[PDB]
Every structure is written in C-alpha cells, then in structure tokens.
C-alpha cells in the first residue's frame, strides 16, 4: 500500500523513459548505455530491481518484465553476463558467469522481502546454486559478489526462517575475512551487515579498518552505501555529495545520474543509475529526519556536504566549499513554512507544497545551514503576419463561409447546424479563436443540432 517517494520515482521514470527497449528474445528490459544500444545486462536489471524493491507494486509491469528476462537468462541457477545484439556492420548471448551475480541474489531477496513470492523462490534457488558452486572451489569468485551474497543470505534468513542460511553466512563470513575502492565498499557493507546480525567485534574491527583505509561515479555510490552502513556522517555525506556533483535534476520528472562529468560520454550508464537511486534512498532513509528529506544538491566545483544532523527540532548541514559560489539544495517535505539560516544572515528560500529549494551563496570556509521547520516568529519568506484580432476576424469569416457553403450544397438545416459544429471544430484546429468562444459555440451548435433533428 506504500507509495514511492519523489526521488526514487524521478530516477526510475527517467531510466524507464530513456533506457527501455526490446531484448533479443522478446521480453522488454534495460540495455547498458544510451550509445551502446546492443548489450542487455541481467545484472543491470537486478540493480534496477534492488532500486525499486521497497515500492515494487508501483512498477508492477516493468518488474514482471525484468523478472521474466532474468528467468530466461538463467541456465540452471547462475545468470549469464550479456545478451548482445550482433553488430550488422536462436540465442545470441555470451555464456560467461555474470559478475556481481551476488548482487542479483541480493536484489531478488530484497524483492522477496516486500512480496513477489516468485522473486523469493528465485532468490532461494539461485542462492543454493551459487552456494554449491562456491563450496566447490572455496573463495575463488568475485569478492564484491561474495559480499552481496552474505547480504542476500542475511535477508533470506530474515524473511524465510530456514536455519541453514545462518550456518552458511558464518562460513561465508570466514571467506570474506580470507580476502579497489568499490570492492572495499562492498566488503565493509557486508562487514556491517554481519555485525548487525551476529554482534561479533571482529566484524566491526574489519569494518573500521575499511573506514580508516578510505571518477566512475558508481564507486562513489558504493562508498556512500558503505558509509551509510557504518554510520560515519562525514564519509557518507562526502560520498553522496560526490555522487550529486554530476547529476541532472529537474523538479517534475527527470533525475539522471551521469557516469562521468569530466568524461566526454556523460550519458546515463545503467550500471550506475539504479546504484545512485539506492544510494540516495539509503542516505535519506537513514540520516535524514522523518519529514525534511534532502535528496538532491547541486554543488558546483568540488563542494561537498560533510554533516547532516537532526539536532532536536532543527536540521543542521555542515558543508565545505571552494571559491565561494552558490550551491542549491532540494528537500522533500510536506510543510510549507519554515526558516533557513545560512551562517547567520537569514536567507530566503523557495518551497512548493512537496519540494523546498534553497539557493544561497556560501563562503569558502566551512559553513552551517540551519533549517527550522514550523518555527515561531518565522523570518524567511516563501518568494521565488496577422495578429489575434486579425485571426479572430478571419475565423468569423471562415465560419460564415463554411456555413453558407454547406447550406448551398445541401438545403437541409440539420446538415447546416452539423456543419456549424464542425466549423467550430475547424476554426479551433487552426487556433483562430480563443477556446472560450469556440467551446461556447460548439455546445450551442450541439444542442441546436439536436433541437433541429427533433423539430423535423
């Protein structure tokens, strides 16, 4: 019965409007890049499923389509990597095992947690297949996929209740203790999940080791998710700000995560857009307060948000910037009136009934933005050839012309009033009349036509 929030809806809407086409086999699915147009990655659709799992019932058709795509893209329990369109200058798909397939298991498990029993059964079957495959070797697989496997096992034990999962993750934990930026982020994420489930200190020790250890946007999104798992405001906020530096957002519909600002091919890489959605929604759900939800921030140059704390009844944003300039913050909210404070100058702000937006000018040094919702003695305000007459004359002339021509051709009066109706329609089609007079004359002609038909 839950409804998706605005940021998730915007991101998924943009991806669906731009990154939705026909797979080689028949089920509609997402391709990889706007320019590539050929490869269809089941892992990418798994990422989208992870992004949209909490509000799955909303995008029922798309989730059903991608679930069918995954069903026909699995040999026994392990998914393939690509479904490539042949370059012209019966199955066409490379059969190598798909990287980050543990991400696929995690996505299916997350879908199963909120419903979609088909997704839950899929997750269980693929869990068993990949666990047997791993026990065949030991730890000779992708490490980030292994971390996502531990996460998926934790979720499955949470929602299924089967005891074997427990033992499995313990053994899996050892494998993660047996072992780039993104892999370190996922390893720390799995460390935090393992601590949350078993409360053993060594998992925290490894997680804080990864913490202390700390281009191609996605890596920043995994880093932000890892920092969100840990609980470090500074690292998570910095990573999510690095994520936001190169996104394109408009208020109503679009929320596009570019893959590289400096690179020529910004585009919308499907590997990162669901990752960006997950990072944004995780950051909002964890660190933002109940109502005031910060999901987008345009920070020019290398400006980065450091802290976001809900102190009592007021939100504090501690932010670092370079060479002054202005940043623009957008908060999802319900309240209309509330006062923002940049440093201590009481700047104004813009706020719709669902989105508020501030565009202040920030000093080079660290600066604090204090947003107080529903405040007493509010200070901030809520501020943000021919011509028509010639065309109207031409429209009157055309109307009389067509009416007279119809009466001349056919002596019947019902045909004449019907022609008056269609003349109103025609003169509206050319935009010669305003809609007011056009609609008035159309309704009058309708009723008079029926009266004339009655009176015959």
């Amino acid at each position: 019965v839950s409804l998706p929030p605005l940021y998730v809806e915007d991101a998924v809407n943009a991806e669906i409007q731009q990154l939705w086409s026909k797979s080689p086999t028949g089920v509609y699915a997402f391709h990889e890049a706007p320019s590539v147009n050929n490869s269809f990655w089941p892992d990418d659709n798994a990422k989208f499923l992870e992004s949209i799992a909490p509000w799955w019932q909303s995008y029922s058709s798309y989730v059903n389509s991608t679930l069918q795509f995954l069903q026909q893209s699995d040999v026994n329990g392990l998914f393939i990597k690509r479904f490539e369109y042949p370059l012209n200058p019966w199955w066409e798909a490379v059969w190598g095992e798909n990287y980050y397939e543990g991400e696929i298991i995690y996505a299916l498990a997350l879908l199963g947690k909120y419903g979609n029993s088909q997704a839950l059964q899929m997750a269980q079957q693929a869990w068993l297949s990949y666990y047997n495959q791993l026990k065949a070797y030991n730890g000779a697989t992708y490490t980030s996929s292994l971390a996502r496997f531990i996460m998926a096992t934790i979720l499955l034990y949470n929602i299924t209740g089967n005891t074997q999962y427990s033992n499995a993750y313990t053994q899996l934990a050892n494998w993660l203790l047996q072992y780039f930026l993104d892999i370190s982020a996922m390893a720390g994420q799995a460390m935090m999940a393992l601590y949350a489930v078993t409360k053993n200190i060594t998992y925290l020790l490894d997680a804080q080791l990864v913490m202390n250890a700390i281009y191609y946007t996605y890596k920043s999104e995994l880093v932000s998710e890892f920092g969100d798992a840990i609980g470090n405001n500074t690292l998570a906020s910095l990573a999510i700000s690095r994520v936001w530096q190169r996104t394109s957002y408009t208020y109503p519909t679009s929320y596009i995560y570019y893959v590289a600002r400096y690179g020529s091919g910004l585009q919308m890489n499907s590997e990162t857009q669901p990752w960006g959605d997950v990072a944004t929604q995780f950051y909002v759900n964890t660190w933002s307060p109940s109502n005031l939800d910060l999901f987008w921030a345009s920070l020019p140059n290398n400006n980065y948000i450091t802290n976001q704390t809900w102190n009592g009844t007021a939100l504090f944003i501690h932010l670092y910037a370079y060479q002054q300039s202005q940043v623009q913050l957008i908060f999802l909210t319900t309240t209309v009136n509330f006062n923002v404070l940049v440093n201590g100058n009481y700047t104004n702000y813009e706020a719709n009934h669902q989105i508020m937006q501030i565009a202040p000018t920030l000093e080079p040094g660290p600066n604090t933005i204090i947003i107080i919702p529903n405040p007493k003695n509010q200070v901030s305000q809520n501020t943000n050839t021919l011509t028509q007459n010639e065309l109207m004359l031409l429209g009157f002339v055309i109307y009389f012309v067509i009416i007279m021509v119809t009466y001349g051709v056919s002596r019947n009066k019902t045909i004449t009033v019907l022609s008056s109706i269609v003349a109103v329609a025609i003169v509206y089609a050319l935009a010669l009349w305003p809609t007011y007079m056009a609609f008035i004359l159309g309704a009058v002609g309708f009723f008079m036509l029926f009266y004339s038909i009655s009176r015959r």
């Binding site: 019965v1 839950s2 409804l3 998706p4 809806e9 915007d10 998924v12 809407n13 669906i16 409007q17 509000w55 019932q57 909303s58 995008y59 029922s60 058709s61 798309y62 109503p252 519909t253 009934h353 119809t406 051709v409 056919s410 019947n412 019902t414 045909i415 019907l418 022609s419 269609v422 329609a425 025609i426 089609a429 050319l430 935009a431 038909i453 015959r456």
Partner: protein, 185 residues
C-alpha cells in the same frame, strides 16, 4: 473517517490507458458511501471522474484514466469527509503521430501530419460522410455513417479514438428511448 488504498496505483502508465484502484474507507458503519476521483495536472486543476457508491464492506473498486501530462494528481474524495491524493508520472505521448500503412508486407507508406491539418482533414471528412449518410439513410444514417467515417479516420492518422464514444453515447440514449416506447403504455 480515513480512506486508504488497498492496491498500489501503477506509476508510469501508458499515455491514454486506465488502471484500477482499490480504495477502502474507515468508520463506514454499514452503508454505501459516495466517492469521486478528481484526476488532473497540478492539484488546483482537477477534472472529476468515476462517480459511484462503495460497497457496504467499505471498499470500492474504481477506474482511473491517465492524462497526457507529465505530472498527474489523482484525488479520491469521500464527498464530505476526508480525502487523499497521490501523484503519478505517466509517459508523455508526442503531439505529432506517425502512421504506417503496411502494403505487400515489407513496403510501408509512413506519414505524419501536423495536428491542425489532421484535425481539419478529419473534420471535413466527417462532414462529407455525415452528409452522405443523411442523404442515404436518414437521421439514424447520421450516426451510422458518423461511426463509419470516424472508423475510416482512425484507420488513417486523423481524429482521435475517444470521439467514437461520444457518438456511441448518443446512439445509446436513442436506443433506450425506442425500447421504452415499445414497453409501456
């Protein structure tokens, strides 16, 4: 009382389709209650649809269309008591429509006209067909050949489909009348 949604409304639906909503009321004692679904772009400009009375259970099943706008607010109203709205982002359909008439399989005559010239062409075609129908059959010929001409327009890239329902409405009432005229005294 309070009103809730038992079924999640599909975000991002097609341009001119419809979807079912499963809305259930709270402290409805035992009686059917009225409702209305105001659907439209921006909460200020709402167009009302879907009158009806919910079941005695307190749950009503209704049909909601999707407008040709980026943002659509759908607002279930109890008509007196509490109400609630949700936003949906339907896929926008381009104003210009391109139609492909397939002849001899592979070859296809593809064409697209501006909306104004298509509208005026369809209007003149409707004039011609309705006049011919009036000459041939009569007042019922008006409706019959209007349906035929609007079908032949829908085959091409011309007047939209929903216009048919208008005529399909107006015939229905007439039919009812004649049936009544053959039943009572």
């Amino acid at each position: 009382g309070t009103i809730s949604l038992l079924s999640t409304p599909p975000v991002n639906p097609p341009a001119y389709s419809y979807f079912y909503i499963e809305f259930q009321f709270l402290p409805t004692n035992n009686t059917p209650q009225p409702y209305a679904i105001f659907v439209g772009p921006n909460p200020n400009n709402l167009t009302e649809v879907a009158e009806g009375y919910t079941l005695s259970n307190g749950t009503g099943y209704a049909r909601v269309p999707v407008i040709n706008a980026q943002t659509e607010y759908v607002d279930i109203v109890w008509v007196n008591q509490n109400y609630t709205m949700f936003e949906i982002f339907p896929q926008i359909q381009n104003a210009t429509t391109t139609v492909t008439l397939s002849a001899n399989n592979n070859q296809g005559f593809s064409f697209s006209l501006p909306t104004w010239v298509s509208w005026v062409i369809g209007a003149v075609l409707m004039l011609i067909f309705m006049g011919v129908g009036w000459k041939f059959m009569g007042p019922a010929g008006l409706a019959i050949f209007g349906i035929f001409g609007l079908f032949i327009a829908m085959f091409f890239g011309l007047l939209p489909s929903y216009l048919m329902y208008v005529i399909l409405f107006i015939v229905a009432i007439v039919g009812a009348r004649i049936l009544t005229k053959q039943l009572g005294g």
